[PDB]
Write an enzyme that holds these catalytic residues in place. Structure first.
Site, short mmCIF file in Angstrom:
data_model
loop_
_atom_site.label_atom_id
_atom_site.label_comp_id
_atom_site.label_asym_id
_atom_site.label_seq_id
_atom_site.Cartn_x
_atom_site.Cartn_y
_atom_site.Cartn_z
N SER A 1 1.00 -25.88 -6.26
CA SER A 1 2.33 -25.46 -5.85
C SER A 1 2.55 -24.00 -6.19
O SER A 1 1.97 -23.47 -7.15
CB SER A 1 3.41 -26.31 -6.53
OG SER A 1 3.48 -26.05 -7.92
N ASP A 2 3.37 -23.33 -5.39
CA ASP A 2 3.79 -21.98 -5.73
C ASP A 2 4.68 -22.03 -6.97
O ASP A 2 5.38 -23.01 -7.22
CB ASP A 2 4.53 -21.34 -4.56
CG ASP A 2 4.51 -19.82 -4.62
OD1 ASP A 2 4.03 -19.27 -5.63
OD2 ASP A 2 4.97 -19.18 -3.65
N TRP A 3 4.64 -20.95 -7.74
CA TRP A 3 5.31 -20.90 -9.03
C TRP A 3 6.82 -21.05 -8.87
O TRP A 3 7.54 -20.06 -8.65
CB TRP A 3 4.96 -19.60 -9.76
CG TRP A 3 3.70 -19.70 -10.59
CD1 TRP A 3 3.58 -19.51 -11.93
CD2 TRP A 3 2.38 -20.04 -10.12
NE1 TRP A 3 2.28 -19.69 -12.33
CE2 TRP A 3 1.52 -20.02 -11.24
CE3 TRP A 3 1.85 -20.35 -8.86
CZ2 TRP A 3 0.16 -20.30 -11.14
CZ3 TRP A 3 0.50 -20.63 -8.77
CH2 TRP A 3 -0.33 -20.60 -9.90
#
Lengths: 709, 704
Positions: B242-244
């Site tokens: 996942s993106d941060w």
């Protein structure tokens, strides 16, 4: 587009071929950057050529938590919880070389997990005085015991691809004024007491890193001492490793270049000015000015590259692990064999299987020993306290606790709002109504006890523990004393208490190792690595009035004279006919052992290929099974120079079952009878009658024979 | 007996099954989520190493604190700053893209990093998207052909790539609360092709979900694209990281296929795949089979990276890595205009004036995740002065935009221009180096552009320099197209992008003539903002919902994105897609078609050939671009679509033959009714030229 593999990047080529090619491709700036630090515990390497960084890690007993890039402050990482292994003074008390290798192998795997190149350990400085605050991470006062226990330690760590660091290659035998102390010791005492441990760790242990200490020798710091680093270590012993300076030990550029300082670290308060190191820009400006060439530089780079190829450049190194079941079992097994049974009157120990209603007294029963101490600080994943270890073994409802005393203070709220006299009043009040009283006292890791940069004020226990133990023994004769210390302590109460044990600082599985001995699940087999003096004047360094040294008139240097010479530790009390509380190599067990006469007429001088065989029968004549450290001592009847009454030259630890008898055979070579002549500057054996002493201790000699050489 | 998960002689999946059987439920939960800012704990007991993520599709981000975004202060993380991915796509060279990835992977192995957060191949549907500079243009085929070699290069070192923003993250405004509504045709023909090629062919080991939403589901836990499309249809065996900050739901993160969680807002025990997941498993709401699938993939990622030993050690700031960034920049610079062959400059060129902030401003520091500590960054003024030493190059500030680098100039905007035009009169050439920067509102990640025009009033500055001197040259440093009202006033215009470490040196090689410009535009340089299909139909930001905070953007231009819109609407941009001049000329022969041919396949492709010759005096490279046009399709299809290209280097006077093998992927479309890729029989016109509009040869063919 398919060029041939560069020689320094070719695994199929020998190591010395790759180092030569890597050296020819490095610039002078890259060579100088390689020999000094870029952070608090790291060197830059050669990022352009792909030569990785060298990451030094602290702790001979574990992996120090990650610190910030420049400061000593903890970086705040949540993945650096390690397994705290027993201190080296406890590992040496095991007298088990097989465990010392398992100790090092388990530590090396944890260093590999943390991606650490060099472990700053072990330390083998001879315990010259019982006041040295750093003796807890050494291997006692005997040069032979420390030598045969440092080699497996180095073999274990370096088997995983992580280098060991011979800590304090010097005469750093006391922490007071350690940065300005010039030791003036005779050559005879140098070769027979303080060097044998470091020599066996270099020529036999094959250590890849040797750390110089802060002190001085012959008006030269040991991080750049021409006499011991070049003439003795690199030339005489043919050392091919790296001489890393202790964090702050370098003080002169000219000496660091020509006296053999290969790797510089922690150069000074603060140490974040890495360009101002004595082997950084001052070395670079001197090479540019023509003061030095590149000979000393290429030698330092050739050694640091050799350390890099032995570690980070390798490929078949094990990845290691941390907080594994095997690592906890090693620390558990070391502690079970490290606890020394000093006194056991009327066989009060072990406790019976129906041990109900037990009283535990002491701060060390609930005080953590893994955190603190400066470089010895460790963030253990878990530390089994002596109280908690005795509770899980004897039942929590069957064990009660009283504080007893207060000393000092990982989130432990060890504060107690009771006065020192009120703490003693209700502690002895519970001892009257208790079946057994388990006292867990001793020292700690605060400044002045078992801690670096400081020494002890005396031999007596601090915080007034002599009065608390005497009061508990007066209200209950079944008082058992557990002493946690890296140095011997005064015992004016040994005749009042029933049992005394030296349990050291065991680390993680500390409480479980103590409970295994108290309950009887583990038969005590530890032997003392030093002399437990009854008073401070029994030590040769303090008897002759030569412990702190004398400060120079127009200088800040301290000149200390090792006037005791070769008579250090038990070598002094045997010559002076003194009677300590417990002597070197003392160790009781829950089962008596029997010795026989030496099998073994007039033979010549033995050699390494043709040694003097000595056999001795050992038999277990008790009801329990346990281990026994069969020690071998050699005495020269009529020597030309002064020699001690006996010197430990061999030992072996063997497990026996109740009723078992074995025949232990020892191979004694020329090292068991030789001595160093300071005039001819060489070892030599003199023909004559030699007495071979074999027993359970240095004073508990069971069998003695004679043979002429 | 060595344990199976530690035995290298066993298959990887057998080692994963044995490692999975030895992990506890708590160890399984800790494995699938983070323990710090850029690291996951792994399995410390069993010896399974940690996974260390690192930012930078163009480099290696400096080390940050364990639980903070602040820089940690390390003095060993100075890396090589490679050109932006919008410049790599401008090269159209697949060989440079692999060497780009190979050099970056070696620097990732040096910093001991497991996964590089890159590359991003989000289709630039709007010229206002802030982070288009780290993407690969507007065409799906160009991105799909440049992403595969990039992944091969990085993963050859044992460092996994992170296919960034597997979604429709085409703009940054309201990127966390934006629900994209796009048809299946535009999804399959524009936005997905770049990702499918990187997964099926590039074999990426990590895919990153974006912040936006699709079908009212965040893409970090989207059942439609992560499960149905990625893991099922494409048979993806890697990790869906996942993106941060992109995970927002515990229930969806378990079922919709989230494998590794990072940067969740709060600490690490409170992640959506942490204690909420561990409690739901013990309570009986979720099983361990979906948990084992996440562990199976995270372990597979670990066994492809940190568990191995045969990986190369890597290096940083080596001669090879600088040479790679040098080669990428020389072939990335796009020569847009070159009136009267003003470029290259003569060998004795003197009295040169450089104007602009971007001529002395560093483009590698700043921008949040794109920030890099470059060991060296050759400024455009430093590169031009190294090529023309002594007093051959003068400099004037010109303008101020923003700001260890002292960019202070205490002069009014009128005074800055007055000093620039006064020196432009007494100068042989005017080398203006302008464009955008990495501040918020330009080429930055957390914002979008306010418009298409150049900021800080650069239009009035370029017009004033062109009036004072007809020999004015413009160098544009931007990841997005910029408005050019001064196009007819400037002699030469170059799109030089953000080149990173060897930026100024690559410019001097092109300006002086030491290298022939071979770059083509990866997007359509619009002349106005309304020439973009996303902005003409009024559907860039979306619509804010009344009650909820979710924004609904509706991709109304559908497949007609970029040059597919200006060709249908017959609009004239400043420079079309695939545009790029050269210091030499190239001539195209007649297209050679075989003698009513059937629909080709992968085993029997449609072979086409076109003669290429260098009809000039200088050596150079030309990007021959092949386009396909369907005359009478069923559904709507663009006037032409890029389907093949090859970059060839030709000596002066040399002529070669380029043979292209066109299979069914060059003539097929996606019909939303049948939910498949079908080929319609009819006449197809194969167009080949130097650009999307500079078609040099064409020929029709009928398929059946």
């Amino acid at each position: 587009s398919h060029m041939q593999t560069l020689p320094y990047l070719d695994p199929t080529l020998p190591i010395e071929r790759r180092i030569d090619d890597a050296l020819a491709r490095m610039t002078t700036a890259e060579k100088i950057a390689l020999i000094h630090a870029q952070s608090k515990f790291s060197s830059p390497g050669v990022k352009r050529l792909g030569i990785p960084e060298l990451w030094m890690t602290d702790g001979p007993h574990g992996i120090r938590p990650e610190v910030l890039w420049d400061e000593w402050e903890q970086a705040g990482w949540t993945n650096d919880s390690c397994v705290a292994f027993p201190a080296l003074t406890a590992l040496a008390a095991t007298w088990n070389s097989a465990l010392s290798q398992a100790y090092g192998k388990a530590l090396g795997e944890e260093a590999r997990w943390r991606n650490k190149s060099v472990v700053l350990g072990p330390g083998v400085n001879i315990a010259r005085t019982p006041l040295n605050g750093r003796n807890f991470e050494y291997m006692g006062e005997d040069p032979y015991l420390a030598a045969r226990m440092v080699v497996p330690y180095i073999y274990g760590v370096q088997s995983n691809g992580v280098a060991t660091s011979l800590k304090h290659f010097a005469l750093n035998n006391h922490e007071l004024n350690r940065h300005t102390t010039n030791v003036r010791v005779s050559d005879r005492a140098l070769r027979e007491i303080y060097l044998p441990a470091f020599e066996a760790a270099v020529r036999e242990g094959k250590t890849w890193t040797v750390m110089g200490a802060y002190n001085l020798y012959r008006d030269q710091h040991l991080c750049h001492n021409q006499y011991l680093l070049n003439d003795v270590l690199k030339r005489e012993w043919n050392y091919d490793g790296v001489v890393v300076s202790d964090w702050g030990g370098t003080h002169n550029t000219d000496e660091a270049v020509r006296h053999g300082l290969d790797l510089e670290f922690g150069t000074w308060g603060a140490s974040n000015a890495y360009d101002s190191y004595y082997l950084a820009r001052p070395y670079a400006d001197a090479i540019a000015a023509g003061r030095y060439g590149t000979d000393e530089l290429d030698d330092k780079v050739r050694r640091v590259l050799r350390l890099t190829y032995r570690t980070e450049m390798r490929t078949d190194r094990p990845r290691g692990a941390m907080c594994s079941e095997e690592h906890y079992a090693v620390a558990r097994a070391v502690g079970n064999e490290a606890i020394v049974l000093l006194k056991n009157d009327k066989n009060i120990l072990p406790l019976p299987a129906d041990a109900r209603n037990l009283l535990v007294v002491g701060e060390n029963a609930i005080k953590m020993m893994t955190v603190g101490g400066g470089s010895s600080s460790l963030k253990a994943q878990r530390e089994v306290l002596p109280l908690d270890g005795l509770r899980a073994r004897f039942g929590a409802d069957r064990v009660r606790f009283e504080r007893g005393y207060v000393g000092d203070v990982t989130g432990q709220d060890l504060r107690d709002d009771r006065s020192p006299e009120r703490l003693m009043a209700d502690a002895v009040a519970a001892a009257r109504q208790a079946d057994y009283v388990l006292f867990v006292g001793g020292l700690n890791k605060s400044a002045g006890q078992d801690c670096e940069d400081s020494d002890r004020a005396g031999l007596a226990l601090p915080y007034g523990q002599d009065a608390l133990i005497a009061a508990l023994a007066k209200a209950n004769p079944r008082t058992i004393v557990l002493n946690i210390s890296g140095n011997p302590v005064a015992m004016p109460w040994k005749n009042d208490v029933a049992a005394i044990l030296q349990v050291w600082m065991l680390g993680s599985e500390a409480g479980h190792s103590m409970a295994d001995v108290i309950s009887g699940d583990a038969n005590p087999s530890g032997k003392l690595p030093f002399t437990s003096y009854a008073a401070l004047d029994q030590c040769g360094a303090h008897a002759l009035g030569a412990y702190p040294g004398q400060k120079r008139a127009d200088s800040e240097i301290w000149d200390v004279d090792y006037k005791e010479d070769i008579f250090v530790g038990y070598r002094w009390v045997d010559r002076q006919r003194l009677q300590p509380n417990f002597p070197f190599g003392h160790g009781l067990s829950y089962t008596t052992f029997a010795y026989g006469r030496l099998q073994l007429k007039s033979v010549a001088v033995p050699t390494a290929s043709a040694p003097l065989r000595v056999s001795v029968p050992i038999a277990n004549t008790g009801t329990r099974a346990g281990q026994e450290v069969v020690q071998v001592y050699v005495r020269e009847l009529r020597p030309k120079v002064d020699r001690p009454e006996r010197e430990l030259k061999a030992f072996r630890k063997v497990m026996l079952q109740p009723g078992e008898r074995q025949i232990l055979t020892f191979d004694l070579d020329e090292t068991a009878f030789r001595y160093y002549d300071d005039k001819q500057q060489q070892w030599v054996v003199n023909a004559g009658e030699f007495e071979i002493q074999i027993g359970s201790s240095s004073r508990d000699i069971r069998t003695k024979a004679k043979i002429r050489l």
